[PDB]
Every structure is written in structure tokens, then in C-alpha cells.
């Protein structure tokens, strides 16, 4: 939730600075890492209940 | 400037035509159709912008 | 030179913005690719 709010607030930038820079790259990487980890957790908990 | 703004509208029209083709071929697909097969794992992926 | 700038020249020219409303960044490709 914190990461996606960061994405909308940083993406509403004024026109001479709306860039694709080092901040956007690591923000997108962080969002994908979060989704990957909370995909792995479901598999782990199902193996636990089995 | 008039022609450039035209070209922007034409590009939007092209994207919407491609979307119409894909989603119409989705919607009119039926059970007991010919082009159906298993594809495991596309419900796991969600890459949308 | 007054004729060294026209609308047909700065319409071509690239340092000026002339921006649109799309924010997606399309990619280009090379023929061997």
C-alpha cells in the first residue's frame, strides 16, 4: 500500500520534470518483489496445513 | 499542429480497434469450441499498467 | 538569417518539446534484433 501510494504521488509531477529516473526503477522493482514474496507465502502455508 | 493532433487521434483509434478484435474473439468464444486448451498459470500473472 | 527558421524547419527540429498527453515510453528496434 505504501509503494503504490508513492507511485501515484510521484507520478503526478509537473511537466519539465516528469522523467523516468533511478527512483522509478527501484520503486517498480520493489513492487514486483512484494508481489513475488506474497505469492510464495500462500504455497508455504498450504504445505503447512497438509 | 492540426495534422499532428490528427495523428494522435488515429493512433488511439488503432489501439482501440486491436482491443475490439481481441475482446470480441474472447466474448463470442463458446464451450465445445475448437480453439480451447489447457494453459496453466496465466491467472498467476497480472502485468497491467 | 530569417528564412533559416521557418515552420517547416522547427516543425522538424527536436530540442523543442512539442509534447503530447501520453506518458508511455515506446521502444525502438534494430533490424538484426
Amino acid at each position: 500500500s505504501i509503494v503504490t501510494d508513492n507511485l501515484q504521488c510521484r507520478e503526478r509531477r509537473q511537466h519539465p520534470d516528469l522523467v523516468r529516473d533511478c527512483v522509478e526503477i527501484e520503486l517498480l522493482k520493489e513492487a514486483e518483489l512484494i508481489r513475488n514474496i506474497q505469492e510464495l507465502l500462500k504455497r508455504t502455508i498450504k504445505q503447512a496445513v497438509s | 499542429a492540426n495534422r499532428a493532433a490528427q495523428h494522435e487521434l488515429e493512433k488511439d483509434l488503432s489501439d482501440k480497434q486491436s482491443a475490439y478484435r481481441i475482446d470480441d474473439k474472447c466474448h463470442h468464444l463458446r464451450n465445445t469450441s475448437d480453439g480451447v486448451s489447457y494453459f496453466h498459470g496465466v491467472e498467476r500473472v497480472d502485468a497491467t499498467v | 538569417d530569417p528564412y533559416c527558421t521557418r515552420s517547416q524547419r522547427v516543425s522538424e527540429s527536436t530540442m523543442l518539446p512539442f509534447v503530447s498527453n501520453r506518458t508511455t515510453l515506446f521502444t525502438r528496434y534494430t533490424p538484426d534484433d
Partner: peptide, 28 residues
């Protein structure tokens, strides 16, 4: 060939700028 060199800076398979050879340009 100024725009040819300008496009050829970004001509590889990566995220290129708004550099459309005629017309408008991406905002980002």
C-alpha cells in the same frame, strides 16, 4: 541527418524517448 543521429542514439532495444520523427512526443 541530425534527427537520424538523434534516433540512432536510442536505436537499440530499450525504452526510447518521445522522439517520433514527425509529430508529437511522449510526456515522460
Amino acid at each position: 541527418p541530425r534527427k537520424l543521429y538523434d534516433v540512432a542514439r536510442n536505436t537499440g532495444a530499450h525504452t526510447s524517448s518521445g522522439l517520433a520523427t514527425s509529430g508529437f512526443r511522449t510526456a515522460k
